Write a protein that binds this ligand. Structure first.
Ligand SMILES: *[C@@H]1O[C@H](CO)[C@@H](O[C@@H]2O[C@H](CO)[C@@H](O)[C@H](O)[C@H]2NC(C)=O)[C@H](O)[C@H]1NC(C)=O
Ligand SMILES: *[C@@H]1O[C@H](CO)[C@@H](O[C@@H]2O[C@H](CO)[C@@H](O)[C@H](O)[C@H]2NC(C)=O)[C@H](O)[C@H]1NC(C)=O
Lengths: 48, 48, 49
């Protein structure tokens, strides 16, 4: 379960709206906001 | 993403492939239609 | 809605888009607040000719 979602949008940097679809461990979240995305986005896991 | 109606179709197939997109045929069933109303020209996946 | 949306000094809370580079698509929503240009010059910051 390594791929978990997507960012969609014309400008992912709060100049415009964008769509987040992200399947986290507990419950998938879908959101449409003027998101200010990170230059290198990911989700992290403690292993063992 | 048509007229803001961001439409998702999907399928899940059990495989045993090692290093390629599995050769074969399957049709995706529509699951949900989001009324998002935004400009989607770009996208980026989220990984763990 | 003149009983709901009009004020004796002017209800200036109701905005509309006055400029855009081209027409938008059916059921699309333009919310962009970037400065538009009516001339061949580029324009930057908050205001200009
Ligand atoms: C969605 O976003 C893209 C990217 O910003 C828009 O492409 C722009 O189109 C205008 C049209 O006048 C050009 O002036 C810009 O230079 C374009 N930008 C880029 C980076 O290519 C596109 O028009 C938007 N679509 C809608 C329907 O709003
Ligand atoms: C995945 O994201 C969702 C949405 O942010 C998280 O749901 C939150 O869970 C906490 C703890 O139960 C609640 O207090 C919040 O109200 C929830 N937020 C929403 C908007 O539902 C969820 O916890 C996240 N899962 C993981 C594994 O972090």
């Amino acid at each position: 379960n390594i791929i978990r979602g997507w960012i969609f949008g014309t400008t992912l940097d709060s100049k415009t709206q964008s769509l987040l679809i992200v399947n986290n461990a507990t419950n998938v979240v879908i959101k449409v906001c003027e998101f200010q995305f990170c230059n290198d986005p990911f989700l992290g896991v403690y292993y063992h | 993403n048509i007229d803001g109606y961001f439409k998702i179709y999907s399928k899940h197939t059990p495989i045993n492939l090692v290093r390629d997109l599995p050769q074969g045929f399957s049709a995706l069933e529509p699951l949900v239609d989001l009324p998002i109303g935004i400009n989607i020209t770009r996208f980026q996946t989220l990984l763990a | 809605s003149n009983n709901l949306d009009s004020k004796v000094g002017g209800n200036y809370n109701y905005l509309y888009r006055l400029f855009r580079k081209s027409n938008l698509k059916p059921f699309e929503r333009d919310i962009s607040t970037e400065i538009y240009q009516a001339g061949s010059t580029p324009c930057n910051g908050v205001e200009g000719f």
